[PDB]
Design a protein around this ligand. Structure first.
Ligand SMILES: [Fe+3]
Ligand SMILES: [Fe+3]
Ligand SMILES: [Fe+3]
Ligand SMILES: [Fe+3]
Ligand SMILES: [Fe+3]
Ligand SMILES: [Fe+3]
Ligand SMILES: [Fe+3]
Ligand SMILES: [Fe+3]
Ligand SMILES: [Fe+3]
Ligand SMILES: [Fe+3]
Ligand SMILES: [Fe+3]
Ligand SMILES: [Fe+3]
Ligand SMILES: [Fe+3]
Ligand SMILES: [Fe+3]
Lengths: 173, 172, 172, 172, 173, 172
């Protein structure tokens, strides 16, 4: 039996598949960052980063759904072993923030390519993703700022960890 | 500051970390099988397999949580790319069933090692996982049986795909 | 058309089929014990034992369901007439208590074999069964204790029957 | 202490005890047939026959209750193991339909003897049983008819098993 | 009149009785640790340890119920005077955590013996206990970690005590 | 940091700490009596005594709370093992009633010392305890009276055990 061809162009297909793989990669990175926090008495940051890892996987699934719907083969690559050694809470959120900036940038590139190729169905689909990613980028910016403001003298790490705990719990519900 | 050592033994740690990586790998395999179905007009199997991949990732997450709680470092390794070449619906479910068998065996192994080690916190923890995995293996056995019963004569693939669709919809 | 092979090992299959048959036999025994009580003015004990017979059959059915889901042929053997001659209430519950001990022993043996062969799906499945059987065994122990405490003298049989009647009714 | 004699006549007692054992044997037969279907990818027929087996045991229980109520000893006899080898779905339902006919005939025989011996208490009690057995016999005729109508060509077996599955589920 | 013999084997009987006595002993120890905290201005830790003492007694009662049900005589031994002198909050939770590890270990020994002797009714009964004890062990690990993270410079003891207070109140309801 | 001194006098502290240890001891005694009953077919008395031991521990806890609130160190001493040798139901309740009498006397002593010391915070606090203890002593007097009224002739022990069971059930 004959099935219909992919409904998206080859360039967009490639970019969307790469984005699926990026989100999968992010999910692993944040799981690893989470584990570091949990094994260093920072269960607030642990929980936040675990829940964030899970959310990145939710993004990957939403992208896959769109690919499936459009008759586009999903091409899952080898996911690389995440960084597992970190210096401290500040370095983790510095790295995480830099990571989210890169994700934001790669999204902008797909959206820009959708415009250039006049693929406005893909442009429209991506809007929820642009919005949620921007909110995520701002949140990491905000936590990094707060970690820097608190500092890690006496019980500063405890305070910073409880602040992050409060954010994680407030976002569950 | 001093953080408490891992609360689990080195052997158990190794086995549980390995299992996390196995579930991640299963999730990718099923998304790959799911996409093969969708791109070959089998959105019923496609749906079922997608939903099953997401469930494998849920098992991965619950394993991670248990490691985190026991102060055990989570050791995520490179996840090799899943196979993407399939001959048909029957082959996908034959591969899927053999896969669930291997996953069931790997779980039995950990549970047995927990018993050897007298680690009954881990034994107790793994019980939902043993249960849920058995349900999964049965389900794949049942679907495989049904695909084979229907066969691939005139509109047989359609009937099989509708059947799997019904199951996917009833489980969510 | 091709159906999948049984999902359990030969020895587990054998033990589990033997157990289905033990439960079927138990139901027969308890019906006959129940009838003896009913024809000897002991309707309270009759009711208790009738309801317990029915629950043995429920256990047989739950085992059969598990055999079905694992693609295991259920092999029912010949039924031999249950013992039908009894001496009195005390003897019936003595025999019953001893029978329940034997049922507990045979379950423990299946569970122990599940561990030895690392069949943790079966081990996990049998847990409700281990728990319910133990509750049944404790109950027969309790009733036998009470029958002895009360005695056979001067409306003692009436009081013991009313006691067992109360238990039967409260378990509905 | 003196207990009252059986309230039914010896011939009626005999026929009623025979009937209890026939229902026990029916339960066994249908469990075996059910298992056959389950192990040959016919879970729809499997479920139907399992549920029907359990209902035959319910019939046995209600007859036993009536014997208990009339101070009649229940005499459970030895029964051969049920047939376990079958040729296919059609053969199973042919055998089952022939079996339901025999049960129907056996009930009519008891009812007729109740009329002849002026045992109208027993006649009255058996009316629920006559009505339910008739409904069962009709159901088996209908399923057998539908199986032959569908046939065994390509996916006919699947369509037939799905039809029986819908009946099983709708009967609760 | 004749009563039925115990339904459990002599080895399991002995182990279960010893476990009842261990839980009773724990209850006293935690009452004593609680009193120390209350008399040293640490009412948060005071409350937590008091509620925990009470929970250990709940465990002992559940074990006794099972013994009673099985016609096994309950053999209560002399309960020894608990440690009453402690150095500080950190030492108390270090001791408590070490204590919970020992309890966890003794449970594993009973469960292991149940398997060896094929006593699967006892194996099954003990599962709630394995689960609750593991949760307790993890909780003490978590509090010890947090006490160490906070430290006791300036008002660190106050912060640590309020953290424990929050845990105690959240577990009541 | 400086923590405030105890808010109670040394004599009161001594008496209240002693009372905590007395309640702990009572709890163990009653669990011991409770187990004697259960192991001798008296699950009614067994239940009642178990429930009463748990209540003695509740009194211990409320005393501890009051000491904690007043910044008084709690001084738990070695709790001697309770007696385990009993001759029968009557002896257990004879011992139990004499025990509750001694506990009532010990409470009266503390309350009297509170009055001598003008410690009316403690006097006021102890009022629920005086009340609840009196109710307890009456109850044991009532049960002892009833056990003795029933006596131990043919099924008398059963009737007494059922009576105490009713009380236990009505109080929870
Ligand atoms: Fe993101
Ligand atoms: Fe993202
Ligand atoms: Fe699975
Ligand atoms: Fe799995
Ligand atoms: Fe067709
Ligand atoms: Fe039983
Ligand atoms: Fe049973
Ligand atoms: Fe019928
Ligand atoms: Fe019938
Ligand atoms: Fe504990
Ligand atoms: Fe504990
Ligand atoms: Fe008292
Ligand atoms: Fe008192
Ligand atoms: Fe009397």
């Amino acid at each position: 039996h004959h099935s219909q061809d992919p409904m998206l162009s080859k360039d967009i297909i490639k970019l969307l598949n790469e984005q699926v793989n990026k989100e999968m990669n992010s999910s692993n990175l944040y799981m690893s960052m989470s584990s570091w926090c949990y094994t260093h008495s920072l269960d607030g940051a642990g929980l936040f980063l675990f829940d964030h890892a899970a959310e990145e996987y939710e993004h990957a699934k939403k992208l896959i759904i769109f690919l499936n719907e459009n008759n586009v083969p999903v091409q899952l690559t080898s996911i690389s072993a995440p960084e597992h050694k970190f210096e401290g809470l500040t370095q983790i959120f510095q790295k995480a923030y830099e990571h989210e900036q890169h994700i934001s940038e790669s999204i902008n590139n797909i959206v820009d390519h959708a415009i250039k190729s006049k693929d406005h169905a893909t442009f429209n689909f991506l809007q929820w993703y642009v919005a949620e990613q921007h909110e995520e980028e701002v949140l990491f910016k905000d936590i990094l700022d707060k970690i820097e403001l608190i500092g890690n003298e006496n019980h500063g790490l405890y305070l910073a960890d409880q602040y992050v705990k409060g954010i994680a719990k407030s976002r569950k519900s």
